[PDB]
C-alpha cells in the first residue's frame, strides 16, 4: 500500500526528466510541419492531438490516477508537469479524453468455429495489418477471420436503420419536458421550444466513426453512401 508514495517520488524525479527529454527532442524536430501532423491516425481517432509531451502527460496521469486511490502525488505531478509545459490546469486541453471513438458491432458469428463475439471496428491497429484486418477481426474461439464485404454491407444497413430512427424520432419541449403530442405546434403547450431526442451530433459522431472505418479499410460502397449523406447537410 504505502509503496505508492515511494514510486511517486521516484516518478517525481523521472517523469520530470522524461518530459524534458521528449519536449526538447520533439520541438526541435525539423520534419514537423505542424506538431499535430506528428500523431498517428487510427479509425477511432477524432481528437485534435497537438503537442506530444502534453498528450503523454495526460495519458500517463490517467492510468496512474486510476491504478491507485492515492492520487495525491499524481495530481501534484499533473500540476507540476502542466506548469513545466506552461499549459494551464482547468483548461480544456488539460482534460483527458479517450483518443478512440470506440464502436462495437455485437454478436458477430463465425462458421469456422460456430461461435459469436462482439467486434470493435475503431479499436484495432490498422497500420500493422491493413488487408490483414480481417484476420485481425478474428473470432475469439479461434483465429478465423470476419470478412470486409459482409461487414461493409452490415455498416451500410446499420446506417439505414439509424437514419430511420433519427428521421422518425420523438421531440421534447425544453420547458414542459413531455414528448411533442401533435404536428401542429411550433411551441409546446407552454411557450418553450422543442429539441431533438436523437441529436444531430450523435449522427455526426457515428458518421465520422463509419467514415474513418471505411477510409482505413477501403470500403468504397460505404464511402459512396456516406459521401451522399455528408453532402445533403447544413
Amino acid at each position: 500500500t504505502f509503496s505508492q508514495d515511494y514510486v511517486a517520488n521516484e516518478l517525481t524525479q523521472s517523469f520530470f526528466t522524461i518530459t524534458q527529454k521528449i519536449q526538447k527532442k520533439v520541438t526541435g524536430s525539423r520534419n514537423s510541419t505542424e506538431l499535430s501532423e506528428m500523431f498517428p491516425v487510427l479509425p477511432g481517432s477524432h481528437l485534435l492531438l497537438n503537442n506530444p509531451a502534453l498528450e503523454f502527460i495526460k495519458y500517463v496521469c490517467k492510468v496512474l490516477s486510476l491504478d491507485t486511490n492515492i492520487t495525491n502525488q499524481v495530481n501534484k505531478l499533473n500540476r507540476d508537469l502542466l506548469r513545466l509545459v506552461d499549459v494551464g490546469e482547468f483548461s480544456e486541453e488539460a482534460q483527458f479524453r479517450d483518443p478512440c471513438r470506440s464502436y462495437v458491432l455485437p454478436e458477430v458469428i463465425c462458421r469456422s468455429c460456430n461461435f459469436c463475439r462482439d467486434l470493435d471496428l475503431c479499436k484495432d491497429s490498422s497500420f500493422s495489418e491493413d488487408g490483414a484486418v480481417l484476420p485481425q477481426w478474428l473470432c475469439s474461439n479461434c483465429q478465423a477471420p470476419y470478412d470486409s464485404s459482409a461487414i461493409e454491407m452490415t455498416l451500410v444497413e446499420v446506417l439505414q436503420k439509424k437514419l430511420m430512427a433519427f428521421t422518425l424520432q420523438d421531440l421534447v419541449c425544453l420547458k414542459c419536458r413531455g414528448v411533442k403530442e401533435t404536428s401542429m405546434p411550433v411551441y409546446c403547450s407552454c411557450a418553450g421550444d422543442f429539441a431533438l431526442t436523437i441529436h444531430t451530433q450523435v449522427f455526426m459522431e457515428q458518421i465520422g466513426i463509419f467514415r474513418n472505418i471505411a477510409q482505413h479499410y477501403g470500403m468504397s460502397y460505404l464511402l459512396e453512401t456516406l459521401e451522399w449523406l455528408l453532402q445533403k447537410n447544413p
Binding site: 420547458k175 411551441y187 407552454c190 411557450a191 418553450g192
Partner: protein, 162 residues
C-alpha cells in the same frame, strides 16, 4: 417572500395583492436555476467584463449605442401610434378565451385562487405589447406575427404564474 423562490410553497412565495398584480402587464418569476454550463459561460463573461473596464469603451457589432437607442426610443414614441389588424385581433380574442379557461380550470383544480390573476387588463397588456413591437418598426399596424411575439412574451410571463 422566502428570499429564494421555493417551489414547494407555491403561491406563498408572493405577498403582493391580486389588485396590484393585475396592474402589471408582465410578471417575471426569474428563478436562478443552477447549471454547470451556464455557470461556466456566465463566469467567463463576468471575468472578461471586469477585464474590459480598461479597453476604451469600444462599441460592439449588431448593437445600438445607449445614446442612439435613447433618441430612437424618443423618436418612435412621439411619431408612431399603431393599432391591431383585424385578423390579428381575432387571433388574440380566441387565444384570450383559451388562456382564461386554462386559468379558471387551474384554480378549480387547486381549489384556491391563484396569486397572479388573468383579466381584461392582461388582454389589453398583450394588445399594447404588440403595439410596442410594431412601434419599434414604425409600422401603423400590428401583424399576426407581432401579436404572436406578444403572446410568446406573455406566455413566458404566464408560465411564471402557473
Amino acid at each position: 417572500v422566502f428570499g429564494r423562490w421555493d417551489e414547494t410553497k407555491g403561491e406563498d412565495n408572493i405577498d403582493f395583492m391580486p389588485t396590484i398584480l393585475s396592474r402589471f402587464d408582465m410578471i417575471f418569476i426569474v428563478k436562478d436555476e443552477h447549471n454547470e454550463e451556464r455557470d461556466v459561460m456566465l463566469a467567463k463573461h463576468v471575468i472578461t467584463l471586469h477585464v474590459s473596464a480598461l479597453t476604451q469603451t469600444q462599441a460592439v457589432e449588431g448593437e445600438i449605442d445607449l445614446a442612439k437607442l435613447k433618441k430612437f426610443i424618443a423618436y418612435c414614441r412621439v411619431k408612431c401610434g399603431p393599432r391591431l389588424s383585424a385578423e390579428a385581433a381575432e387571433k388574440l380574442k380566441n387565444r384570450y378565451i383559451i388562456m382564461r379557461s386554462g386559468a379558471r380550470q387551474h384554480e378549480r383544480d387547486s381549489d384556491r385562487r391563484s396569486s397572479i390573476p388573468i383579466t381584461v387588463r392582461q388582454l389589453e397588456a398583450i394588445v399594447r405589447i404588440a403595439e410596442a413591437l410594431s412601434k419599434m418598426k414604425l409600422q401603423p399596424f400590428a401583424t399576426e406575427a407581432d401579436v404572436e411575439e406578444a403572446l410568446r412574451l406573455f406566455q413566458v410571463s404566464t408560465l411564471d404564474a402557473a
